[PDB]
Scaffold this active site. Structure first.
Site, PDB file in Angstrom:
ATOM      1  N   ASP A   1     -19.368  64.486  41.840  1.00  0.00           N
ATOM      2  CA  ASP A   1     -20.013  63.647  40.843  1.00  0.00           C
ATOM      3  C   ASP A   1     -20.634  64.411  39.680  1.00  0.00           C
ATOM      4  O   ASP A   1     -21.712  64.989  39.814  1.00  0.00           O
ATOM      5  CB  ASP A   1     -21.059  62.791  41.568  1.00  0.00           C
TER       6      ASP A   1
ATOM      7  N   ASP B   1     -19.588  60.723  33.621  1.00  0.00           N
ATOM      8  CA  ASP B   1     -20.117  60.570  34.981  1.00  0.00           C
ATOM      9  C   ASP B   1     -19.039  60.154  35.967  1.00  0.00           C
ATOM     10  O   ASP B   1     -18.719  58.973  36.051  1.00  0.00           O
ATOM     11  CB  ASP B   1     -21.234  59.522  34.955  1.00  0.00           C
TER      12      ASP B   1
HETATM   13  C1  012 Z   1     -25.218  63.650  34.606  1.00  0.00           C
HETATM   14  O1  012 Z   1     -26.259  64.605  34.611  1.00  0.00           O
HETATM   15  C2  012 Z   1     -27.552  64.063  34.520  1.00  0.00           C
HETATM   16  C3  012 Z   1     -28.099  63.534  33.315  1.00  0.00           C
HETATM   17  C4  012 Z   1     -29.418  63.017  33.296  1.00  0.00           C
HETATM   18  C5  012 Z   1     -30.196  63.025  34.475  1.00  0.00           C
HETATM   19  C6  012 Z   1     -29.660  63.548  35.686  1.00  0.00           C
HETATM   20  C7  012 Z   1     -30.496  63.568  36.948  1.00  0.00           C
HETATM   21  N1  012 Z   1     -30.172  62.630  38.069  1.00  0.00           N
HETATM   22  C8  012 Z   1     -29.815  61.269  37.724  1.00  0.00           C
HETATM   23  C9  012 Z   1     -29.072  60.813  38.969  1.00  0.00           C
HETATM   24  C10 012 Z   1     -28.234  59.581  38.725  1.00  0.00           C
HETATM   25  O2  012 Z   1     -28.749  58.460  38.731  1.00  0.00           O
HETATM   26  N2  012 Z   1     -26.915  59.890  38.484  1.00  0.00           N
HETATM   27  C11 012 Z   1     -25.860  58.913  38.183  1.00  0.00           C
HETATM   28  C12 012 Z   1     -25.520  59.012  36.674  1.00  0.00           C
HETATM   29  C13 012 Z   1     -26.748  58.804  35.807  1.00  0.00           C
HETATM   30  C14 012 Z   1     -27.293  59.879  35.057  1.00  0.00           C
HETATM   31  C15 012 Z   1     -28.449  59.688  34.259  1.00  0.00           C
HETATM   32  C16 012 Z   1     -29.076  58.433  34.202  1.00  0.00           C
HETATM   33  C17 012 Z   1     -28.544  57.359  34.942  1.00  0.00           C
HETATM   34  C18 012 Z   1     -27.388  57.545  35.739  1.00  0.00           C
HETATM   35  C19 012 Z   1     -24.633  59.178  39.072  1.00  0.00           C
HETATM   36  O3  012 Z   1     -23.638  58.225  38.766  1.00  0.00           O
HETATM   37  C20 012 Z   1     -24.996  59.080  40.543  1.00  0.00           C
HETATM   38  N3  012 Z   1     -23.814  58.862  41.406  1.00  0.00           N
HETATM   39  C21 012 Z   1     -24.093  58.276  42.744  1.00  0.00           C
HETATM   40  C22 012 Z   1     -24.645  56.876  42.628  1.00  0.00           C
HETATM   41  C23 012 Z   1     -25.999  56.588  42.954  1.00  0.00           C
HETATM   42  C24 012 Z   1     -26.499  55.273  42.822  1.00  0.00           C
HETATM   43  C25 012 Z   1     -25.652  54.239  42.363  1.00  0.00           C
HETATM   44  C26 012 Z   1     -24.283  54.507  42.031  1.00  0.00           C
HETATM   45  N4  012 Z   1     -23.431  53.488  41.574  1.00  0.00           N
HETATM   46  C27 012 Z   1     -23.970  52.176  41.189  1.00  0.00           C
HETATM   47  C28 012 Z   1     -21.980  53.701  41.466  1.00  0.00           C
HETATM   48  C29 012 Z   1     -23.806  55.834  42.173  1.00  0.00           C
HETATM   49  N5  012 Z   1     -28.264  61.954  39.365  1.00  0.00           N
HETATM   50  C30 012 Z   1     -29.068  62.989  38.883  1.00  0.00           C
HETATM   51  O4  012 Z   1     -28.814  64.141  39.176  1.00  0.00           O
HETATM   52  C31 012 Z   1     -28.343  64.062  35.685  1.00  0.00           C
END
Ligand code: 012
Ligand code: CL
Ligand code: CL
Ligand code: CL
Ligand code: CL
Ligand code: CL
Length: 379
Positions: free
Chosen positions: A225, A38
């Protein structure tokens, strides 16, 4: 210079829509775990206690090299969240560079909407910068450790390959595999070292300009990302794009619920009318002043396939309130180099990207573009 990383090629797996993960080991003896790659996070966290969706987990009491940081931490994502306890241990990447480093590890003990049912991964490797790591910036991210402790160059590259139900790809740590791409590599500066922030200066749909102040393209910010599936776009830009993408695909009309990702569309096995959907282009700021380059994807990229006698898909371009997210739908078309040492991100046509006989993703340049600094947003 090494141009062939034979051992790292094809070290990524995953299931469509559930992310790409790499095998890693932590502890003494080694405990094997599949970790989500990620680039939109900076915390290295692993399941560290029983949970129905975990086939296995990290057992601290069984590691000689384990050390408790005696501190807690939780991390809120977009919809899932976890909470754990900090520590350090030795970590490895079997199909990565041959070295074992000591890194910070969040042992997850409580979580919500985090681990997925049958996802096959048990942790997450945030490859972003310390600036966004929880609890705070002083908790050195994993890649940073791996670098200071070994002689691996400060850079990793990613080739994510979709499909048309198990995705694959490769994470080259410390270098660039020439086998993973064709054509040339174009670089865009990394605006600030926190998320992997870049700057989009023009957007096109089948060649037709969206024609918006380029500040709207980076409203809040734009990031690469691998932790996000879709090509998330700011409210105003998303609106303009769907109108355009709809006009371009007008040969066939779809329920408002499609363009909203709510419902999927189907077609008789192997008769998906790709040609009716337009290509999407994003011009990114290049390294030389007044120069930009262009990356282009295909419907095959943004029409994500979803598990009948038909091939069904769901629209993968969603609206966003926190800036543009160049998710996997973007990445899967290119071999993306995260050249951290030179503060830049490279793109090249991916040698594995899914495409049909007539079209292919692409990366072309340069394009004489002026006033790009004002395309970036500021507080
Ligand atoms: C990686 O591919 C995936 C795998 C499972 C589910 C998904 C679907 N969702 C989950 C969602 C999402 O929450 N993506 C974060 C990684 C992740 C995947 C699955 C579960 C939990 C977390 C990703 O890091 C988001 N980046 C921006 C962000 C947002 C909020 C806080 C932060 N911090 C604290 C740095 C950063 N993105 C998606 O597309 C994608
Ligand atoms: Cl070579
Ligand atoms: Cl290698
Ligand atoms: Cl600490
Ligand atoms: Cl929680
Ligand atoms: Cl076609």
């Amino acid at each position: 210079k090494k141009g062939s990383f034979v051992e790292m090629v094809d070290n990524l797996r995953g299931k469509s829509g559930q992310g790409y993960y790499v095998e890693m080991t932590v502890g003494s003896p080694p405990q094997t775990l599949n970790i989500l790659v990620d680039t939109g996070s900076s915390n290295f966290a692993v399941g560290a206690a029983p949970h129905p969706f975990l086939h296995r987990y990290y057992q601290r009491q069984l590691s000689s090299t384990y050390r408790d940081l005696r501190k807690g931490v939780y991390v809120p994502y977009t919809q899932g969240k976890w909470e754990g306890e900090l520590g350090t241990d030795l970590v490895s990447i079997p199909h990565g560079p041959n070295v074992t480093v000591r890194a910070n590890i969040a042992a997850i003990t409580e979580s919500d909407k985090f681990f997925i049912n049958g996802s096959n991964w048990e942790g997450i490797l945030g490859l972003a910068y310390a600036e966004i790591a929880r609890p705070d910036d002083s908790l050195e991210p994993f890649f940073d450790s791996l670098v200071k402790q070994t002689h691996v160059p400060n850079l990793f590259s990613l080739q994510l390959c979709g499909a048309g139900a198990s995705v694959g790809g490769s994470m080259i740590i410390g270098g660039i595999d020439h086998s993973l791409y064709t054509g040339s590599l174009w670089y865009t500066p990394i605006r600030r070292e926190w998320y992997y922030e870049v700057i989009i200066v023009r957007v096109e749909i089948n060649g037709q300009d969206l024609k918006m102040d380029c500040k709207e393209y980076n409203y809040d910010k734009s990031i690469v990302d691998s932790g996000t599936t879709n090509l998330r776009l700011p409210k105003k830009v998303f609106e303009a794009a769907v109108k355009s993408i709809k006009a371009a695909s007008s040969t066939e009309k779809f329920p408002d619920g499609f363009w909203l990702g709510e419902q999927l569309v189907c077609w008789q096995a192997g008769t998906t009318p790709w040609n009716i959907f337009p290509v999407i282009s994003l011009y990114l700021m290049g390294e030389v002043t007044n120069q930009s380059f262009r990356i282009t994807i295909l419907p095959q990229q943004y029409l994500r396939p979803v598990e009948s006698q038909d091939d069904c898909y769901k629209f993968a371009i969603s609206q966003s309130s926190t800036g543009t997210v160049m998710g996997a739908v973007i990445m899967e078309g290119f071999y993306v180099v995260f050249d951290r040492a030179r503060k830049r991100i490279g793109f090249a046509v991916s040698a594995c990207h899914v495409h049909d006989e007539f079209r292919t993703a692409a990366v072309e340049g340069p394009f004489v573009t002026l006033d790009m600094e004002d395309c970036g947003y500021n507080i």
